[PDB]
A and B are shown apart, each in its own frame.
Chain A
């Protein structure tokens, strides 16, 4: 029942030139308020540009210097200079470096030692030294290591055992053992199991059902029952469905129309819902969702890594899906 109603005058064509302009100009208030996530913001902007064939409009040399300055003595990478290292921003940094074929700008051996150090006895990962445990971090750890060619650095069976202990009655996955299923965590856990070659442990028909039931009459996807749709679920939900070989279980035309309706025709960018304020986060996940759905003006995107497939082909890191 909770849903949006799309206005008859919502955008209905893809505005690639406006979105590239929006990102290329971005950060030239919520920007200073968001310095605490700056590394991820940069990853969103760069990746959406590259999917649109416009990466060259961004400042490579400036970003490489910034990344090097955000690596701490422990090997971990922070969101911004002087902030504390975290697995979230270490992943964003490695994703950025992979896009730029510049991994050796940072100390890879220390990144690896940082990731290794955060794994717990039960196979879980903490986000940083303060000990928060989330399957988001199991994904961050294995994705970082896969991009670096160092997955063998962690205890992979124990990591699998922990993720699997987070599987629920409905076929999904939550934060931690006992936590309710949520699309964000499902994306993280299916991506993890792709990376570690364990997709046969997923109940693809049951989870695929739960995921396709995220699609509301508006065409948008929510992240769990009885919530409002948000265009970023075009990523979390669709990528998971693609990992598990069930992307055809949603109505692609309806979802495409919802995603287009979230564009701001005057500023460029995508918002969480039609008519809302845009941001670079929803711009990436809108465009990436469209790419999953097969939009010809956008490069094919990796459902596991949320980076152009051509980049992953380059590093030879392409997990088999269902």
Chain B
């Protein structure tokens, strides 16, 4: 059965595929082709030529069917796609066909499509195919960035696996504040949200990546306001606390270095150098990266010392 029905499935695939290609060469663009392909695509959704066949069939049937008959076909196609996605949610071919289909409908139900994306994202919050599809739906339905920002918040807060959510915020925030580099009040609120995340789970690498971005998204250090200066100093002390609790946590060590750079490179030169030594011991696979970073910082410190009157 295992190594017997193996050959059963293969022969069925071989034979159905066989028939699809004969029908195609014959110009028989009909429901029989949809039946045959449904059989194959559920198991192998990356067989792009068969998705192409289904499109050719649907296109042809549209011309020769009543609007109501065409409507029925479309609904059956949505259901087929949803069944395929359940089995293989990370197939480029399936998600593409859904997009092709929705883009051509008279009256697409975009709110239902956004809900499909929410369901899939509950099951796999990192499924980039579904996140791209959501962005497509959002654009088509002209959903405003502020509502998408509300969505990301709930996702970041209800559980982890957040890299895809933070990524999406990095794209939405500049749209609420669009400029030909975030406003300081927005940045301060983002720093607060991310500090929350990484203290809530210091192993959450997604929050550290996003925080490094935040730390570059703003002022310049001789341009630090008293509020930002104060907030960055607070973060620095909070990272030192964490380092005490989690002395194998490399993300927090790296972040201490980056905060000191953000605050005053020359004043913290001695501590920055100490921290590189600690960090290399804790994250030996990154020693070459860390040495190049330290070299870059030391060179920047030279340029700063030379700027002195």
Contacts and interface: CB of A to CB of B under 8 A. Distances in A.
A83 B49 contact: yes
Which of A1, A210, A215, A226 has the most chain B CB atoms inside 10 A of its CB?
Answer: A226
Contact of B167 (A32, A128, A181, A226): A181
A208 interface: yes
Given A169-B170, A249-B288, A32 B14 contact: yes
A146 B49 CA distance: 27
Contacts of B209: 170, 210, 225
Contact of B289 (A132, A174, A180, A209): A209
Contact of B126 (A33, A181, A210, A226): A226
Interface string B122-140: 0000101001100100000
A170 B217 CA distance: 12
Interface residues of B, number: 42
Nearest to B217: A169
Interface in B1-41: 6, 10, 13-14, 21
B292 interface: yes
A240 to B, nearest CB: 15
A120 interface: no
A36 B49 contact: yes
Contact of B210 (A131, A169, A246): A169
B196 interface: no
Nearest to A88: B48
Contacts of A84: 48-49, 52
A178 B47 contact: no
Which of A208, A251, A254 has the most chain B CB atoms inside 10 A of its CB?
Answer: A251
Interface string B32-64: 000000000000101111011001000000000
Interface in A1-18: 1
A36 B213 contact: no
A316 B166 CA distance: 43
Contacts of B44: 33, 36
B199 interface: no
B132 A205 contact: no
B285 interface: yes
B100 interface: yes
Contact of A249 (B171, B284, B286): B286
Given A84-B49, A169-B210, A225-B163, A180 B55 contact: no
Dominant secondary structure at the B interface: helix
A182 interface: yes
A188 to B, nearest CB: 14
A12 B259 CA distance: 42
Contact of B163 (A132, A215, A226): A226
A225 B132 contact: no
A127 B110 CA distance: 25
Contact of A130 (B21, B96, B167): B96
B205 interface: yes
A137 to B, nearest CB: 11
A251 B289 CA distance: 10
B289 A169 contact: no
A194 B171 CA distance: 26
B255 interface: no
Contacts of A246: 289
A168 B170 contact: yes
Given A179-B128, A180-B164, A130 B52 contact: yes
9 contacts: A32-B10, A78-B49, A83-B49, A170-B213, A178-B168, A180-B164, A205-B296, A246-B289, A249-B286
Given A36-B49, A168-B170, 17 more contacts: A83-B49, A86-B48, A168-B167, A169-B167, A169-B213, A170-B209, A175-B128, A175-B132, A176-B132, A178-B168, A180-B163, A180-B167, A224-B163, A226-B126, A249-B288, A249-B289, A251-B284
